[PDB]
Write a protein that binds this ligand. Structure first.
Ligand SMILES: [Ca+2]
Ligand SMILES: [Ca+2]
Ligand SMILES: [Ca+2]
Ligand SMILES: [Ca+2]
Ligand SMILES: [Zn+2]
Length: 316
């Protein structure tokens, strides 16, 4: 809507206070006009109809329990937009400042979050397995990254291409978590997963096997479940990304870490310049090697580490 840009205050899912960009026109709306064509957050009101109604508030103060998921979805979408703009010089997900839209309070006791091809959607969780999903910065960044992938490589959400699609979202979800410096780690969804259990997460990039996901190509899932194991086989790529950044010895293969910044640069270039809709793991290796070569030279330590990392996880 058309109005005056202002700043409100509220509390997120984890009880932390933060300032959020809003728009005033009779009501205060969760509409951030400071980033691209805007960031809009909607209330799905426990229904499945999308996007719902643009979030309206009477006093620009969002401290109600019902407001929490909206506060975080709105705020973290902003942080993710900043990451892509400041670190990769990318304006929004389409590269042309497309408006970012998110709907919270989707359905009842819904344990997932997703990008539906047009916007992000967040469930509130069942209170046991998950609390409102927008409370996790890595979750929000994971979802917005699916939008970036859709407008670039266009990786099909099935089999190996789908596993890469998923890994890319976990990789950048984690890099954004480090960017925001919010208790960063190489785990996925730890802030909103199982509130009754501390120290766990949905997936682990440092050690995928911790939760039963493969950490080597020889252990890849070849079934039909989960669209060919897109959330399972992503562990093979996540482990490779972790090794490239942090280094380590995996299955007898030693990798010298080159850091998170370079990891981000290499994968962003691979995603936007070399990957295609049907790229498989072997092609991802080639794309990553070529990207590192473009940026640091064929005889660089960076290229060597990328090769070692993929060798470690058995991707030739
Ligand atoms: Ca209020
Ligand atoms: Ca964390
Ligand atoms: Ca995390
Ligand atoms: Ca937990
Ligand atoms: Zn995903």
């Amino acid at each position: 809507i058309t109005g005056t840009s202002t700043v409100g205050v509220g509390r997120g899912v984890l009880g932390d206070q933060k300032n959020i960009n809003t728009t005033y026109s009779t009501y205060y709306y969760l509409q951030d006009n400071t980033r691209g064509n805007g960031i809009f957050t909607y209330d799905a009101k426990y229904r499945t109809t999308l996007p719902g109604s643009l979030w309206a508030d009477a006093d620009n103060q969002f401290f109600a329990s019902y407001d929490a998921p909206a506060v975080d979805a709105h705020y973290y979408a902003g942080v993710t937009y900043d990451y892509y703009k400041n670190v990769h010089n990318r304006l929004s997900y389409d590269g042309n400042n497309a408006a970012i839209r998110s709907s919270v309070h989707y359905s009842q006791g819904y344990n997932n979050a997703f990008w539906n091809g047009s916007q992000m959607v967040y469930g509130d969780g069942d209170g046991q397995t998950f609390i409102p999903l927008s409370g996790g910065i890595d979750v929000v960044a994971h979802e917005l990254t699916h939008a970036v992938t859709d407008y670039t490589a266009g990786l099909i959400y099935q089999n190996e291409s789908g596993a890469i699609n998923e890994a890319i979202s976990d990789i950048f979800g984690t890099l954004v978590e480090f960017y925001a410096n919010k208790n960063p780690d190489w785990e996925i969804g730890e802030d909103v997963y199982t509130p009754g259990i501390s120290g766990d997460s949905l997936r682990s990039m440092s050690d995928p096997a911790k939760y039963g996901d493969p950490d080597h190509y020889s252990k890849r899932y070849t079934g039909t479940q989960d669209n060919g194991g897109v959330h399972i086989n992503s562990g093979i790529i996540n482990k490779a990304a972790y090794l490239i950044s942090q280094g380590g010895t995996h299955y007898g293969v030693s990798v010298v870490g080159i850091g998170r910044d370079k990891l981000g640069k290499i994968f962003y270039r691979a995603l936007t310049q070399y990957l295609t809709p049907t790229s498989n793991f072997s092609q991802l290796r080639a794309a990553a090697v070529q990207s590192a070569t473009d940026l640091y030279g064929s005889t660089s330590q960076e290229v060597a580490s990328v090769k070692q990392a993929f060798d470690a996880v058995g991707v030739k």
